[PDB]
Amino acid sequence: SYMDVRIFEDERVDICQDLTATFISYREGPEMFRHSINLEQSSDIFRIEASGEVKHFPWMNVSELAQESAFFVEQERFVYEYIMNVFKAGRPVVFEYRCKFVPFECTVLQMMDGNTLTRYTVDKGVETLGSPPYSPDVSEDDIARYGQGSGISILRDNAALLQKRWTSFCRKIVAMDNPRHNEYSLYSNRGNGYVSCTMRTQVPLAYNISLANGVDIYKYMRMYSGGRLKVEAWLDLRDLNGSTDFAFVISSPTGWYATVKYSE
Amino acid sequence: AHSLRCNLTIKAPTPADPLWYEAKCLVDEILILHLSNINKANATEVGECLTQPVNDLCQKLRDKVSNTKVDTHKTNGYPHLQVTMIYPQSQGQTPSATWEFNISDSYFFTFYTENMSWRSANDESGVIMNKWNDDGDLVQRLKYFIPECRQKIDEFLKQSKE
Numbered sequence: 015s016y017m018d019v020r021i022f023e024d025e026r027v028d029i030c031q032d033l034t035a036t037f038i039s040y041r042e043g044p045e046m047f048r049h050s051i052n053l054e055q056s057s058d059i060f061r062i063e064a065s066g067e068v069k070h071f072p073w074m075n076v077s078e079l080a081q082e083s084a085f086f087v088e089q090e091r092f093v094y095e096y097i098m099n100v101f102k103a104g105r106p107v108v109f110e111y112r113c114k115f116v117p118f119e120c121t122v123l124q125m126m127d128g129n130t131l132t133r134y135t136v137d138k139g140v141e142t143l144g145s146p147p148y149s150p151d152v153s154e155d156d157i158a159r160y161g162q163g164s165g166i167s168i169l170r171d172n173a174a175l176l177q178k179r180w181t182s183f184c185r186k187i188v189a190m191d192n193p194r195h196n197e198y199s200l201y202s203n204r205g206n207g208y209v210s211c212t213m214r215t216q217v218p219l220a221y222n223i224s225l226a227n228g229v230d231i232y233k234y235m236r237m238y239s240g241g242r243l244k245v246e247a248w249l250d251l252r253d254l255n256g257s258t259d260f261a262f263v264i265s266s267p268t269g270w271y272a273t274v275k276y277s278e
Numbered sequence: 279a280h281s282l283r284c285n286l287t288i289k290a291p292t293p294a295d296p297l298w299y300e301a302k303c304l305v306d307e308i309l310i311l312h313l314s315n316i317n318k319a320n321a322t323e324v325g326e327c328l329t330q331p332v333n334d335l336c337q338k339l340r341d342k343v344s345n346t347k348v349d350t351h352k353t354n355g356y357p358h359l360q361v362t363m364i365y366p367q368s369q370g371q372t373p374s375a376t377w378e379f380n381i382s383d384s385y386f387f388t389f390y391t392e393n394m395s396w397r398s399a400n401d402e403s404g405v406i407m408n409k410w411n412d413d414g415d416l417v418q419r420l421k422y423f424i425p426e427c428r429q430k431i432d433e434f435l436k437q438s439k440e
């Protein structure tokens with residue numbers, strides 16, 4: 015074609031050991047939550063948008079996700095009480111449960127407005143890391159105590175079942191992961207000097223896209239309806255200082271990376 | 279005349295009104311997109327493409343508003359933010375967006391994506407602007423907002439005008 019894509023593989027990295035599932039709950043407004051689960055080197059494997067839209071992959075049976083659904087149902091109740099009883103104003107808040115299943119262990123993070131307020135580890139207590147900007151009427155004590163989160167027993171009492179199910183999902187991801195199955199593309203906008211690089215894929219890994227010479231780019235990922243993902247980045251030529259030779263590097267935690275650039 | 283226009287409102291939520299963001303994108307009278315925290319065609323395709331960049335920007339602007347030092351309106355309380363995105367700008371050489379900020383009817387500044395330039399209405403506006411001005415993630419979100427949906431947007435603006 016117009017671009018060339020070189021693929022570099024050294025040794026495949028198995029990312030499914032020491033499995034650690036992160037359950038995220040974001041209360042945006044009244045009965046408006048975005049829930050998501052991911053593994054340590056994956057992007058979201060399961061997600062419920064606040065719109066009610068359910069995003070997952072075709073190899074997952076969502077009906078079989080009873081325990082996690084029950085966990086999120088608990089977060090909806092828990093976060094509702096917390097907000098009404100303490101804040102009294104429905105400001106947005108996030109709770110993040112980072113859980114190892116064997117041996118069972120959770121870390122709970124609470125964030126408001128980009129700021130992390132509390133970290134709850136069961137060995138330590140609640141560590142207060144920050145205070146929310148417009149909360150003069152709210153006590154640090156109350157915030158810390160809610161930093162403990164709720165619902166962890168749903169996860170603990172079902173650890174072995176969750177470890178099995180999520181190890182299976184992890185292995186499926188590792189199994190489908192093939193850099194040659196993804197689609198790569200570049201666009202150059204002559205008018206404004208921008209170049210975009212895009213990778214479409216159906217394999218939810220925590221990909222990293224950057225430019226070979228270190229120049230900053232703007233990047234993000236999008237998750238769509240049918241197990242479809244998009245990694246995308248933007249370059250402003252003239253951040254290159256007169257040059258015109260650049261390459262996007264896209265790297266996967268499984269140990270391969272691809273260079274995408276223009277040639278002859 | 280018929281360009282893409284996006285209006286963002288970011289305010290403090292209350293028990294009476296729990297809304298803290300609202301987004302409306304319009305091409306003339308026709309509503310491409312309507313988003314808020316309370317709830318929520320070539321036109322359907324544009325709207326779908328803008329949905330995520332809009333949500334994430336609104337979340338990001340609230341973060342910026344919450345953590346920033348605004349004293350006027352006599353430090354009345356949590357600031358109220360209005361943003362207007364217009365694409366394409368009339369005075370551009372190449373089609374590019376403008377981003378217009380109104381904080382609390384006290385501070386007014388504008389970002390011109392074409393030359394990455396910022397301008398304020400007055401000295402006190404300039405202070406706030408220059409603090410936003412160096413939030414790199416913010417600037418890049420604004421800059422690459424239209425480019426994310428460029429083809430869908432341009433194609434739609436071309437069909438309108440017909």
Ligand SMILES: *[C@@H]1O[C@H](CO)[C@@H](O)[C@H](O)[C@H]1NC(C)=O
Pocket residue numbers: 075076077078
């Ligand atoms: C899983 O999905 C299947 C259909 O593929 C459905 O019949 C089943 O009820 C779901 N879950 C369970 C536990 O059966």
Ligand SMILES: *[C@@H]1O[C@H](CO)[C@@H](O)[C@H](O)[C@H]1NC(C)=O
Pocket residue numbers: 220221222223224265266267
């Ligand atoms: C992505 O690149 C950053 C540096 O820009 C690096 O610190 C980070 O570890 C990389 N992520 C991956 C998954 O390689």
